Amino acid sequence: TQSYTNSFTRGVYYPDKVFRSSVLHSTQDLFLPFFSNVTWFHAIHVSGTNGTKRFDNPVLPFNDGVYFASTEKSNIIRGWIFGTTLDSKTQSLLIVNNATNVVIKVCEFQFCNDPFLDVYYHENNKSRMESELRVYSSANNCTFEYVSQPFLMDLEGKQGNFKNLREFVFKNIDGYFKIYSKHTPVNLGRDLPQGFSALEPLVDLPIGINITRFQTLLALHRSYLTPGDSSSSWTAGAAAYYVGYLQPRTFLLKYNENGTITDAVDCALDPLS
Amino acid sequence: DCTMYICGDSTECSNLLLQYGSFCTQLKRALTGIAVEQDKNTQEVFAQVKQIYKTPPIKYFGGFNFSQILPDPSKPSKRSPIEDLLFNKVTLADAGFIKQLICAQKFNGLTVLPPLLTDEMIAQYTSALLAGTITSGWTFGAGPALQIPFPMQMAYRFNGIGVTQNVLYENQKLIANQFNSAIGKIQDSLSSTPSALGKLQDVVNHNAQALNTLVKQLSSKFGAISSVLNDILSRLDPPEAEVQIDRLITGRLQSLQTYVTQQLIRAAEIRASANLAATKMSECVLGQSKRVDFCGKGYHLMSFPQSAPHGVVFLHVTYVPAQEKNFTTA
Amino acid sequence: LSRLDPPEAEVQIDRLITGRLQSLQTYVTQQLIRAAEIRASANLAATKMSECVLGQSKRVDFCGKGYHLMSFPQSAPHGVVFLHVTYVPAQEKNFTTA
Amino acid sequence: DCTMYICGDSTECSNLLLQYGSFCTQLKRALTGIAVEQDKNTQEVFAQV
Amino acid sequence: LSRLDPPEAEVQIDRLITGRLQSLQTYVTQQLIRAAEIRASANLAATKM
Amino acid sequence: ETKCTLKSFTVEKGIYQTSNFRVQPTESIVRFPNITNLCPFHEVFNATRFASVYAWNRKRISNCVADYSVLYNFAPFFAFKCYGVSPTKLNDLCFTNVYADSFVIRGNEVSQIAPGQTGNIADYNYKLPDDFTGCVIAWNSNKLDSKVSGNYNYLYRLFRKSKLKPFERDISTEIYQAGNKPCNGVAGFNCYFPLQSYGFRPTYGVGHQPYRVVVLSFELLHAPATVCGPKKSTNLVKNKCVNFNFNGLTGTGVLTESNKKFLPFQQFGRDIADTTDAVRDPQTLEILDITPCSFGGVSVITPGTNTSNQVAVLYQGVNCTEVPVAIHADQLTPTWRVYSTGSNVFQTRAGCLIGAEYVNNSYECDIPIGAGICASYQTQSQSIIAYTMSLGAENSVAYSNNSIAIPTNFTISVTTEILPVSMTKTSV
Numbered sequence A: 001t002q003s004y005t006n007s008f009t010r011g012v013y014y015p016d017k018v019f020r021s022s023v024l025h026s027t028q029d030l031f032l033p034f035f036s037n038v039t040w041f042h043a044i045h046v047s048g049t050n051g052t053k054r055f056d057n058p059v060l061p062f063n064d065g066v067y068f069a070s071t072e073k074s075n076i077i078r079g080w081i082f083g084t085t086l087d088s089k090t091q092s093l094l095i096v097n098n099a100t101n102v103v104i105k106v107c108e109f110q111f112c113n114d115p116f117l118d119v120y121y122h123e124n125n126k127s128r129m130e131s132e133l134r135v136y137s138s139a140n141n142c143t144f145e146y147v148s149q150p151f152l153m154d155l156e157g158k159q160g161n162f163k164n165l166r167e168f169v170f171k172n173i174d175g176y177f178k179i180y181s182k183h184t185p186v187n188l189g190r191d192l193p194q195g196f197s198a199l200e201p202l203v204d205l206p207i208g209i210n211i212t213r214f215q216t217l218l219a220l221h222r223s224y225l226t227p228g229d230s231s232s233s234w235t236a237g238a239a240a241y242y243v244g245y246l247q248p249r250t251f252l253l254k255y256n257e258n259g260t261i262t263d264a265v266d267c268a269l270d271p272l273s
Numbered sequence B: 001d002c003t004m005y006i007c008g009d010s011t012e013c014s015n016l017l018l019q020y021g022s023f024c025t026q027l028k029r030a031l032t033g034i035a036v037e038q039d040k041n042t043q044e045v046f047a048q049v050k051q052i053y054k055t056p057p058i059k060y061f062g063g064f065n066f067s068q069i070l071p072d073p074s075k076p077s078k079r080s081p082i083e084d085l086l087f088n089k090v091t092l093a094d095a096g097f098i099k100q101l102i103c104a105q106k107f108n109g110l111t112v113l114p115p116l117l118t119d120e121m122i123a124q125y126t127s128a129l130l131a132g133t134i135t136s137g138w139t140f141g142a143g144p145a146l147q148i149p150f151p152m153q154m155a156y157r158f159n160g161i162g163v164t165q166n167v168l169y170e171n172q173k174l175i176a177n178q179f180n181s182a183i184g185k186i187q188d189s190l191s192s193t194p195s196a197l198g199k200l201q202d203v204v205n206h207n208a209q210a211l212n213t214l215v216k217q218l219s220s221k222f223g224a225i226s227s228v229l230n231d232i233l234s235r236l237d238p239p240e241a242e243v244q245i246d247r248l249i250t251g252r253l254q255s256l257q258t259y260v261t262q263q264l265i266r267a268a269e270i271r272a273s274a275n276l277a278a279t280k281m282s283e284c285v286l287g288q289s290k291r292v293d294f295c296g297k298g299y300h301l302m303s304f305p306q307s308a309p310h311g312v313v314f315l316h317v318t319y320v321p322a323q324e325k326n327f328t329t330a
Numbered sequence C: 001l002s003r004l005d006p007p008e009a010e011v012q013i014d015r016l017i018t019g020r021l022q023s024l025q026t027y028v029t030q031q032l033i034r035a036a037e038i039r040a041s042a043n044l045a046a047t048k049m050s051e052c053v054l055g056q057s058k059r060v061d062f063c064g065k066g067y068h069l070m071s072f073p074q075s076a077p078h079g080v081v082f083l084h085v086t087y088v089p090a091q092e093k094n095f096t097t098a
Numbered sequence D: 001d002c003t004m005y006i007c008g009d010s011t012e013c014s015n016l017l018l019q020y021g022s023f024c025t026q027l028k029r030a031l032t033g034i035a036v037e038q039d040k041n042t043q044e045v046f047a048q049v
Numbered sequence E: 001l002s003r004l005d006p007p008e009a010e011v012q013i014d015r016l017i018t019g020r021l022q023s024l025q026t027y028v029t030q031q032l033i034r035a036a037e038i039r040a041s042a043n044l045a046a047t048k049m
Numbered sequence F: 001e002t003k004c005t006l007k008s009f010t011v012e013k014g015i016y017q018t019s020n021f022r023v024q025p026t027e028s029i030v031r032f033p034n035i036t037n038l039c040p041f042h043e044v045f046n047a048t049r050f051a052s053v054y055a056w057n058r059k060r061i062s063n064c065v066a067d068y069s070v071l072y073n074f075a076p077f078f079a080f081k082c083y084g085v086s087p088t089k090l091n092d093l094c095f096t097n098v099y100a101d102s103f104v105i106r107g108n109e110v111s112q113i114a115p116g117q118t119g120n121i122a123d124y125n126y127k128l129p130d131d132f133t134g135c136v137i138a139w140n141s142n143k144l145d146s147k148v149s150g151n152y153n154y155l156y157r158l159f160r161k162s163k164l165k166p167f168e169r170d171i172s173t174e175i176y177q178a179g180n181k182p183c184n185g186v187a188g189f190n191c192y193f194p195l196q197s198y199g200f201r202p203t204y205g206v207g208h209q210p211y212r213v214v215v216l217s218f219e220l221l222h223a224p225a226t227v228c229g230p231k232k233s234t235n236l237v238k239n240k241c242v243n244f245n246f247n248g249l250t251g252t253g254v255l256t257e258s259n260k261k262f263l264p265f266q267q268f269g270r271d272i273a274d275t276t277d278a279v280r281d282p283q284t285l286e287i288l289d290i291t292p293c294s295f296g297g298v299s300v301i302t303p304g305t306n307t308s309n310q311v312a313v314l315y316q317g318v319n320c321t322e323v324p325v326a327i328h329a330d331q332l333t334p335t336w337r338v339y340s341t342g343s344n345v346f347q348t349r350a351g352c353l354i355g356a357e358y359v360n361n362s363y364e365c366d367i368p369i370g371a372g373i374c375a376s377y378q379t380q381s382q383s384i385i386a387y388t389m390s391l392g393a394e395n396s397v398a399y400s401n402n403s404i405a406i407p408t409n410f411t412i413s414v415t416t417e418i419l420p421v422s423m424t425k426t427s428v
């Protein structure tokens, strides 16, 4: 499915790595503008005890970075794919998470689509899903690799009330992929809650590719809660998966006395701003 | 200080700046002249009396209530209640009082010297002027102070505006009550108004913002690789550090010259205002002025000066006509 | 010019012209501010010659300390000097007033 | 306007002008201070009634 | 800008900016002094009225 | 000093601002992360199988000590043109991350590997950003890049649909759409491959010889440093004015224990001057605050130089329980540290005054000081005196209900006034 919502005041990160306090320092960089459409997307791969091909996961454009926000239980959303058309003509980037690892790399994947749909993929009865990768099938001219700590540090409150909001920001300015992230488990069920939060960087690394393309990876061997309908064109549909598009804007940031970011003003919004 | 502002604790930058000549002795001389001018302005406005007069310990002026403008000995600062309200309503940014957060962010040679006259002796000038004008009329503005009962002085201030003495001597209770009510309500109107001392607050805030902007100029590259000169001297060889440091010299010196010129123009405007205030104190307070709309609106009666942070406040007691009647005249 | 060649001589001379022009700008600006101050002083002097000299001024503490009587102008290099002859009271007596 | 008088519709000039800092933001304030004062000048002279 | 590469244009654009800004600063300084001249006359007119 | 600040051997009575005092640093400290391993460069340069230019080999260099003083003999180094940091002053800096992008190109194109350049190689093969900071090194490679028949090994890219953003690889085994026919691998008429080779022989002349070029790009910015120069770090000193070289950041001041909340990705502090205020110790990970050394202006109060030659020094806005009261050699910028600093020290709200003594008695004051304090020159046998100025002769009036004072005489006093009317007229 797919649906629209309001971003409110979310998606602002620390632009630089210096420390500031009680200052109104302003920046000009790629940001997510306040009060803009954020489009949900849901992957629906379950039907009784039958395969029932769904042909989900269309191609999402990637321009000037992308903002991500999902509320997954443990590992429903694994990683992301960056590149162009995923063919053995142009090189592309691959992000995929692990139990405690991340193996993001750059290759020339001819094909890496083998979700391994299960005959008993229904999560209520069982969730038998171990090493269901079936990836990196081919590599024509591929030598770049990188392994480090996983981006997402999933924390459980032993109940479903404190759902994590794994806000991520991806940028492609002269290589140097920025993966700003912060976990905000203050969620109570309302999408993109009223309030304010910041994002801290995780890893910075240059490769050099264009990336007019973006999709996500899910652990399809264990999935549930995927309602399906014909909602589109400014409608509603449950996804637990958000995508927003960044543009080069100017932000006025109010650093707290402790050192955190308390508020921000978009300089390309309404004339009062 | 050029030595520390333009160049931060670096011998090479100071030596390079020394080539520019008198672009910094001129700035120090201009700022010293401005400071001396501001020291002279307060003396011109307030120090108009050769001596200092004190009111008698008894406070009876024919029903006139002056308790709101005389100093209160109970208060630690020995200031009038209206003076205390003025002091509370205007907040100063800096005063240079043995400093040894934004003001603390001026480790850049930007020092605010303290005024010559503390606001404890300026209050003494105000008290002396007001005591002279309540206990001697205008006689102390010409020669020796000559005592005179306040009802007689007020009757003659009436006689100055073309109303005979008998009006006051037959309505003295009414004039006393009206003046007391006006003095009582001027404090209430002054306090309740969100911003009545706008001019002095603007005077303080203009200097505060000028110093703030001058501080922020150090974060400007001015076409150089970096806006901090300790990095250029540790990132570039002397042949190119010369050019980059010179570019920073030009930028910071131009900003400082702009600041000094703006300070000169602002000080000229403030000197004009201070000369107007001195004339107003000489004429409205040490005498009665027949100039229309000079000492307040209406037929001027008298005036009381009050000190305020970087300024003066005149309380103009004036005579305004009231309900009128037509008459057939020839 | 004698020691250097035009490719760098023009650059160095341009720098020197910029410096000297900035110095002259500063001199002119200071002269303008000083001229404004002197014009204010000259307006005050003209007012004093118009009132104190060409008449008797009822303004107090304007044409000299004390009650103003009369004034005399005198020329001086780049200025004027006013001789304000004024009336000032003297030894006084107490008196019971009604 | 610094963004037109100094650099005329040149993005690579406007970006380079920012390296001079908040320099002519004072100029906008300085000229606005004059412009605001002018409206006060013609008001205190005439609006005496 | 069309006759120079960005390397040596920036040093050459800076020459134009530091001159136009200097000529723009002079205009503001003249106006500020001229404003005080007018304000002195405006104050006199208000006093004269 | 007063006679020197204004050109005169006579100084009139008054107060003059001469210079500033500031506590000088005692000893310098350097603190770099303790790194013992060395990042090798032999395999970076001594290798005969470097990649071509459309796919240049990029080597990230990590935690090590970059002693760039022994590499000058691993290549001829025809050109060592470097931007940003000057080439010589590289061994005394710390970089966040350094990347060596190596390849070999045609000689005529060596000047084209530079910020903001246009052409075949700076638009379609390898573009360098406008704000590039780093070094570029180029030399010849004809010693081995030569065959009697040909060297069909190296390649580059002629045609690309659009110019590529700086620092991007564009490996693509695709066939360009020459003309209008969309051929699918025919590579015949109107379909030519978008890459041409570098067969090379010693017969070819200068300019077309292969120039091997390696660029080293470093992000000299605020971050936990990874590669550093060969400097032996010293011990840390606190609450004492020193010169610090914290992880490549040089400065002067006092380091104090700081209670800030530096997040793990932050390494430097900042206030509103673009100058560092706080910094974490690179080999201790503790947040310490930098405060610039004690300083202030000095004013010299002199009577008439013909009257006496003794002066009174005022430190503006300084509480001189600090080093002014206990001064020692090589601690203050003014070399005149000859005061006993035990007598005639008076604290003023404008900073303490030394060389003059306060007294309870009050007079009208000659030399202003500030904060209601003034100075003069008085007898007992003679000294510079400091006191609160006397506003005027305190007196009283005789106000009463029915008392009026009437003068019986007068005086005709001729006061004087002086007013400038014009200044000199100057033309230039």
Ligand SMILES: *[C@@H]1O[C@H](CO)[C@@H](O[C@@H]2O[C@H](CO)[C@@H](O)[C@H](O)[C@H]2NC(C)=O)[C@H](O)[C@H]1NC(C)=O
Pocket (backbone or CB within 6 Å): B065, B067, B068, B180, B183, B184
């Ligand atoms: C008018 O004068 C009288 C006394 O002469 C003042 O009366 C006292 O003022 C103090 C100060 O506020 C009060 O605390 C007392 O309660 C007042 N007593 C009485 C009996 O009124 C009076 O305040 C003066 N008027 C004004 C406006 O201050």
Ligand SMILES: *[C@@H]1O[C@H](CO)[C@@H](O[C@@H]2O[C@H](CO)[C@@H](O)[C@H](O)[C@H]2NC(C)=O)[C@H](O)[C@H]1NC(C)=O
Pocket (backbone or CB within 6 Å): C094, F397, F398
């Ligand atoms: C006459 O006027 C003089 C002052 O011009 C008065 O002298 C002082 O008056 C006060 C008021 O009581 C006394 O405290 C002082 O002691 C007086 N001074 C001296 C030197 O005696 C004087 O009281 C007035 N009345 C008379 C009758 O002389």
Ligand SMILES: *[C@@H]1O[C@H](CO)[C@@H](O[C@@H]2O[C@H](CO)[C@@H](O)[C@H](O)[C@H]2NC(C)=O)[C@H](O)[C@H]1NC(C)=O
Pocket (backbone or CB within 6 Å): F408, F409, F410
């Ligand atoms: C007013 O003061 C003048 C001051 O000069 C007095 O004139 C003096 O009077 C004495 C006494 O006769 C003479 O010895 C002096 O020679 C006079 N001075 C001059 C300059 O002539 C005058 O007497 C005083 N008037 C009154 C009424 O006391």
Ligand SMILES: *[C@@H]1O[C@H](CO)[C@@H](O)[C@H](O)[C@H]1NC(C)=O
Pocket (backbone or CB within 6 Å): A004, A035, A036, A037, A233, A234
């Ligand atoms: C989001 O898009 C819909 C249609 O696609 C539009 O009606 C709506 O106004 C958009 N929201 C915002 C905040 O622009």
Ligand SMILES: *[C@@H]1O[C@H](CO)[C@@H](O)[C@H](O)[C@H]1NC(C)=O
Pocket (backbone or CB within 6 Å): F034, F035, F036, F283
């Ligand atoms: C640097 O010194 C600290 C101090 O004990 C030590 O813990 C650390 O291991 C040292 N660094 C290395 C790389 O050994």
Ligand SMILES: *[C@@H]1O[C@H](CO)[C@@H](O)[C@H](O)[C@H]1NC(C)=O
Pocket (backbone or CB within 6 Å): F046, F047, F048
């Ligand atoms: C690399 O070093 C070895 C020394 O063992 C030398 O023989 C060889 O020629 C060097 N290679 C190049 C390309 O200089």
Ligand SMILES: *[C@@H]1O[C@H](CO)[C@@H](O)[C@H](O)[C@H]1NC(C)=O
Pocket (backbone or CB within 6 Å): F010, F304, F306, F307
């Ligand atoms: C200083 O005083 C002496 C008196 O002994 C005098 O001769 C000399 O002219 C005076 N000099 C100045 C400059 O006042």
Ligand SMILES: *[C@@H]1O[C@H](CO)[C@@H](O)[C@H](O)[C@H]1NC(C)=O
Pocket (backbone or CB within 6 Å): B098, B099, B100, F319, F321
């Ligand atoms: C200044 O020094 C005096 C000397 O005793 C001391 O009492 C006072 O606390 C000090 N104040 C500051 C701000 O250092």
Ligand SMILES: *[C@@H]1O[C@H](CO)[C@@H](O)[C@H](O)[C@H]1NC(C)=O
Pocket (backbone or CB within 6 Å): F359, F360
């Ligand atoms: C000055 O006055 C104080 C109290 O006002 C007194 O204790 C002291 O002895 C006087 N003399 C001095 C300080 O020489």
Ligand SMILES: *[C@@H]1O[C@H](CO)[C@@H](O)[C@H](O)[C@H]1NC(C)=O
Pocket (backbone or CB within 6 Å): B058, B060, F399, F400, F401
């Ligand atoms: C004036 O008269 C009032 C009448 O109440 C009296 O209280 C006061 O003491 C008198 N003044 C003098 C100085 O005697």
